[PDB]
Amino acid sequence: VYKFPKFSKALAEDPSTRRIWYGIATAHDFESHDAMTESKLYQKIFASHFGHIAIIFLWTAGNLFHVAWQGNFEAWILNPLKVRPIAHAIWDPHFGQAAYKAFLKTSSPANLALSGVYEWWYTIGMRTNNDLYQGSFFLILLSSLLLFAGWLHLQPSFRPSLDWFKANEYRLNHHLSGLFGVSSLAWTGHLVHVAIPESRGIHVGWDNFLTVLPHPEGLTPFFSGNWKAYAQNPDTASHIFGSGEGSGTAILTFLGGFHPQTKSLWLTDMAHHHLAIAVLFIVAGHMYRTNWLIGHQMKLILEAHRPPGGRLGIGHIGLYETITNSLHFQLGLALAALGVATSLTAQHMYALPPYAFLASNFPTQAALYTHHQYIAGFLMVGAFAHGAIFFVRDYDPAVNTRNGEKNVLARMLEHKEAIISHLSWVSLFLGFHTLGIYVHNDVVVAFGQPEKQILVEPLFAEWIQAASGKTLYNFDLLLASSNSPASVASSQLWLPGWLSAINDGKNSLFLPIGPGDFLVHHAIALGLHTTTLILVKGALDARGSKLMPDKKDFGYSFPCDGPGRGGTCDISAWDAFYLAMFWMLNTIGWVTFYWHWKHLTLWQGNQVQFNESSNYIMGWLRDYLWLNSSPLINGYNPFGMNSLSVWAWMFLFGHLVWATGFMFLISWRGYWQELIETIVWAHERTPLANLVRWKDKPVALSIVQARLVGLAHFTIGYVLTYAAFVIASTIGKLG
Amino acid sequence: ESTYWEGKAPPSVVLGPFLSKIPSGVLGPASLVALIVGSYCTHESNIFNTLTVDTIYPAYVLGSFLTPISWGLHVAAWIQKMNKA
Amino acid sequence: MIYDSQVYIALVIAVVASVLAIRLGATLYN
Amino acid sequence: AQSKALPFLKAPAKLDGSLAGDFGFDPMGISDQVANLKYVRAAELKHCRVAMLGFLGWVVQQYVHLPGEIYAESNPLKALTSVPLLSQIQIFLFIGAIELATLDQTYTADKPWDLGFDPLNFSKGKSEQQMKDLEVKELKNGRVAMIAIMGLIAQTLYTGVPLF
Amino acid sequence: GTPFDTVSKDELAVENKAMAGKSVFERAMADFNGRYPAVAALGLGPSAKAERWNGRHAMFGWIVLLATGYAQAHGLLPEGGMDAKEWGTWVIVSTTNGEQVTIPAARAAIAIGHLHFGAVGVFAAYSKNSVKDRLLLEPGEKDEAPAGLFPALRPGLTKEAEMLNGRVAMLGLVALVAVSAATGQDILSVIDQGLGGLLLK
Amino acid sequence: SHTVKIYDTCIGCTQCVRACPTDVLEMVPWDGCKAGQIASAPRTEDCVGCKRCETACPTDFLSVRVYLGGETTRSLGLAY
Amino acid sequence: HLITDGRWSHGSEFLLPSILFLYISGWIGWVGRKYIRTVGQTSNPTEKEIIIDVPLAISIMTSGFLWPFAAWQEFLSGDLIASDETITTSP
């Protein structure tokens, strides 16, 4: 009953099971630990970062090793459009003979790989199960490096100080230039040297790379300035990927669009992209000042940025010390940027597939988009939660105020009511009218008169599609016109490739849109606005409100303030995160439902099914869920089973976890404490069991813990059931 | 130091210890010349003549970079003029 | 197909990475 | 000014006096980040010793070989692959056995480079000035060897001629 | 970089004078015990108790390897594979083309024998109050003192004799595995070569 | 044990003391209000955190404030 | 399909219904606000909200046809917006 929460003496003195539960959930909140200083905080965070990167590299190495050992990578190379990639083998003693037979792939039961790693590794120039093994070996070596570094930087003479940790200019210069630019430069080097010849049949391994010229002229044009030579003779339109037939000699080109065979971006396009990004980031990494008297001091930049007329208060004067001294502000900024970035990855890796033969891998396309959108929602909610935490525990009004006037951040708490009221107005506006149009379509179609539907053509979005060259909406605007200056400017660089790809019905590049797209985009906007409303309200109201003008004195996460003053359930800022998680899950569900139904109709060919039935709710319920759930639920029946049996089991498992979350959310404490007391009496008053007694007094889960557990069940069930549905439906419908 | 300002124009220290000492009568015309040169270089590399692999012309490219710069030069020119410089 | 030697040495190297992990874990304290 | 190697720069604060071989050569100011010069000196001396041994092995393998056939490769970089993995793993295990105790030793001691290796007692009876002179000799020779062994590796990777 | 100190003066390493002399074995033992208590106090790790137990197991296993070689040579060690219909799909190793290669029956029998011995060990582990030599160290008990480079030359059924023989057997197993890995033959093939041919005859 | 603080906005109306179910609060002499009394929290080890004390507080934003903290068998209301 | 980009050619699909709704909803909001502000200066403002003063309610409701003009005659006089008597939370 002691010594487990070593970091908290208050918990270690708890005589109940709450100590164990809270010991887990407070282990990473280093700022709240006993005998805590800032130096130890930054050093522990640094070591934890090292361990985390080691974990990531070990996970990647495991994926590589299991593809190399139990996969069919080599067979998939020779026939990427017919051979289904294998993730890893299965050894489960609970299998019957039927399950073994159904999951049997080649030599052993195995799982199909939906991560798209086969296409990614094939694109970057891997052709052998020994190339994957080398990658796994190297990644385990890197993990060992990172673990050694993490141990080393906790040693006495190697523990960095607060000044080093808060040295913003040095870290920015190095991160930008070194990390981004130099990693892009090295990736361009690999892309060219290995990937470009490997796509043309020439093997460039760790033996013949110092003697195989990536370009026939060989670094002469680069120093000579004749950089056009690297773009001459690109890959033809009859080039077979991985073979020298119809190949070229160029290494950096503009082509635009996709490879005619793999239906993916040109490797020479991506090498040029990464070279340009490398140059730009290396240049941008010299901005801030270091030991050589030139550069920028960001404190001065922030302080000097006050509009002269005066509408942002005193400007950004106090922001430097605010961000530097707070790890939650930086964490929130990083999480918001990462969420936007992974939303970008999801939205671009389906419209512009970058890996060979990934466009025809429909289950992996759906899985990748869903995975990245869910990660995006999680990251955004985390960014807002950490902003709220910064408000609660790191924000100092004195730093952000100069002689009564407030800086740009402190002024966000002055018109907080205006911000929240207008977020509420936008949410109500969008919800009222999107639901009104959807229900109008529902009722009108149900009454057998679909012509009375309200169908709004998304002209604004179709205008953008025409601006990028789509000649489908008869707009003749910028790139849909051959005479506009936008078209004449790039008529010789990348329009022929771009136009040939955007004006193609088999791509996902700028999918044609209609009224259903309009309505679902408005639903998405409503979801985004409502999630933002909840999170922003929790962040701004974190330090106090009218119901609790001292909420900052109770911390970020507390159960309530009691039944007084009318009742104060879910009044903390943590509860705002807890409520906004449901809205994030709902919004990501809407986004992924829209994407998956649109792409299922596109792949099956019945795009008229979406364009007609997507305007009313029953259309969704009947033609997406009810229609495509048939293959999934018949993964096992009283007659047999298929390789989709695991997905049906996961479907039911997700439903069960969802409803257990419903348990933990609807039923609150107090009802579970008295029942536990009855159980305690029963155990204490029964023979043959009195010999065994608990060391920690069994008590009901706390209010905040119960909310967390219900949210965890809700989210896990949500994710599992939707993953099972999307994967099984795609597999069982599209062969 | 103290780049923070509340008057009509920021102090000349915000321009760095290279632009803080340029007379406004030098920065102004220099900014206008740089803007004109950059606009002409952009309109000669593109717009008037369509771009091609064989026609990149580092002068026009480097030139075009004077347009973004021009913005900074005339901002500094105004700052110097308002600070009696 | 990878050999027994390839898998065995990868397992041995994985063990070394495990001993480095507990050293980091124990250094981050109980 | 205070740098002897770069007579024009002033050396950094941590480059002074003791720690023989101190010629004020730290233009990039790397010593400003390390808490002390103990670990960096240990690493420099380990590199110096390994590079001396590497240069000696390069030349000897160029001219002298073991009686067996597996050691008949003249090119050291080609011998890196021709030699059986058993010999190389034995060498690596020996080095790691030497390295783990010194791993415990280096991160905490005042003289991490002092491994107590003096079987012939070349330092017993030597005065402080003579000991410092010996340390300077070792550091010089090691730096020259490091440059030389890197040059040999580069010229073998670029021309295939392992020597001259 | 220059206007500040990367490492604070208050956080600096101090040389541990408590390990002066203290040959690498003593230093390693002390470092392990200080760094990992509650597993060192149990006798686990680089400890004399663990060394003695592992030596006993290595000697018994040299006996077991000899017995296995004899059984393989003398027509024992049942033939074929396990019945998947009888023992489920967990005994299936691979399916090449329409035939299920299962775990060899000989491997199953050897695993059952090893299970017998391991069960005996587990009983002795959870029988601490009735066994002569316990598996772990009692709280308070102190680990027998390391024997050193060469244990005392005391012939017979002595602690030093068992210690020396356990070290020899463990080194023999290490050498056997090293020879098998380096040369590439089976473990039993290496034992057969190292016995002239008198085992697999 | 939870933390209970009393603030000088106390008007000495005694409603907090007579609402405490575990005898944590008591009325002590004072000279900052008409009643000449102020609430005190000398037995916070018995505080259970039910916050009945501040449900009976008539002052604007409370004069008795309960800050939940470390848990104890007394503060958890455990009869077992 | 409805063309709601703003062009007057398809103006009867969205724009004219938009104007009609804006008029009606502004009428409703104006009469509600006027009733709230009118019974807010009586002895029992809360009583007149559950028990509507039907005479005054009818008087105000039929006066909402000038809500666009009334709104841009009360905003000019500063009677439409409160300034600093509005309450704010602690931060």
Ligand code: CLA
């Ligand atoms: C060149 C030198 C260099 C390099 C390579 C690094 C590299 C790193 N440092 Mg680091 N650091 C440096 C110098 C350097 N540092 C210096 C000088 C200091 C002292 C001032 C620090 C102080 C420091 C601290 C205190 C910490 C790090 C950490 C890290 C790691 C970050 C985690 C990671 O793996 O990210 C990998 C990231 C990438 C490979 C790139 C990310 C790609 C992004 C997401 C895509 C963005 C593209 C685009 C913009 C998207 C938007 C679209 C656009 C249209 C807008 C990383 C390994 C952290 C860590 O984990 O420590 C172990 C940490 O806590 N460093």
Ligand code: CLA
């Ligand atoms: C790199 C990103 C990052 C980082 C560094 C942190 C770091 C931190 N967060 Mg944070 N957070 C993040 C992302 C991040 N978070 C995101 C994305 C969200 C939104 C979901 C949040 C939401 C959040 C909240 C709401 C809170 C924190 C808190 C904290 C602090 C303490 C964490 C703690 O106690 O962990 C405790 C760890 C756990 C309780 C483990 C939970 C594990 C979950 C339930 C998943 C495990 C189930 C698993 C999937 C099983 C699968 C089931 C199977 C059947 C399939 C710490 C500073 C807390 C704090 O006090 O901050 C000051 C706090 O209240 N964060």
Ligand code: CLA
């Ligand atoms: C009739 C008077 C009236 C007026 C002028 C307003 C005006 C406003 N409300 Mg509002 N509101 C009202 C009644 C009114 N409301 C009522 C009765 C409710 C309870 C359901 C709300 C609930 C409400 C919420 C939840 C929100 C607003 C918001 C707003 C603002 C933006 C407009 C909006 O979103 O409409 C919202 C309108 C509704 C949700 C529907 C109102 C219900 C009916 C139609 C109004 C009642 C008519 C009344 C009985 C007429 C009697 C008068 C007669 C006796 C003479 C704006 C200041 C939003 C805001 O703060 O943005 C700045 C916001 O988030 N209001």
Ligand SMILES: CC(/C=C/C=C(C)/C=C/[C@@]12O[C@]1(C)C[C@@H](O)CC2(C)C)=C\C=C\C=C(C)\C=C\C=C(C)\C=C\[C@@]12O[C@]1(C)C[C@@H](O)CC2(C)C
């Ligand atoms: C090996 C060496 C010193 C070895 C000393 C040892 C082991 C001493 C060990 C001991 O003292 C201790 C530690 C402790 C004592 O109690 C015991 C002993 C055992 C006695 C120095 C080498 C020092 C080696 C040096 C300085 C080498 C310099 C090399 C140069 C300049 C080469 C240049 C070229 O190779 C290139 C670059 C390119 C080629 O093509 C052309 C040429 C010209 C050939």
Ligand SMILES: CC(/C=C/C=C(C)/C=C/[C@@]12O[C@]1(C)C[C@@H](O)CC2(C)C)=C\C=C\C=C(C)\C=C\C=C(C)\C=C\[C@@]12O[C@]1(C)C[C@@H](O)CC2(C)C
């Ligand atoms: C070689 C070895 C350890 C070598 C350790 C070394 C060099 C350590 C060196 C260092 O510490 C120093 C000096 C100083 C430190 O600062 C640094 C390092 C470098 C760390 C252990 C072998 C250890 C070998 C062991 C433990 C062998 C155990 C064998 C057993 C138990 C037998 C099992 C069987 O009987 C069964 C169970 C069933 C039968 O069928 C099969 C068999 C296998 C026969």
Ligand SMILES: CC(/C=C/C=C(C)/C=C/[C@@]12O[C@]1(C)C[C@@H](O)CC2(C)C)=C\C=C\C=C(C)\C=C\C=C(C)\C=C\[C@@]12O[C@]1(C)C[C@@H](O)CC2(C)C
């Ligand atoms: C001790 C041993 C076996 C002991 C067995 C015992 C006690 C059995 C006891 C029994 O009660 C049981 C358990 C069960 C009963 O039913 C049977 C009996 C019999 C009653 C095997 C050692 C086996 C020991 C072996 C195989 C040793 C191999 C050593 C090698 C190869 C050494 C090589 C080197 O020496 C060189 C060549 C050069 C050096 O410089 C380097 C190195 C590498 C050190």
Ligand SMILES: CC1=C(/C=C/C(C)=C/C=C/C(C)=C/C=C/C=C(C)/C=C/C=C(C)/C=C/C2=C(C)CCCC2(C)C)C(C)(C)CCC1
């Ligand atoms: C709470 C809080 C927080 C947080 C916050 C957040 C989380 C936010 C988010 C945010 C976000 C998330 C934002 C976003 C943004 C975005 C943007 C801003 C965008 C932009 C874009 C653009 C501008 C584009 C443009 C264009 C176009 C459109 C076309 C193409 C081309 C171009 C480029 C021109 C913090 C921590 C900080 C602090 C405290 C408070």
Ligand code: SF4
């Ligand atoms: S919680 Fe409020 S009421 Fe319950 S005891 Fe402590 S003070 Fe008295």
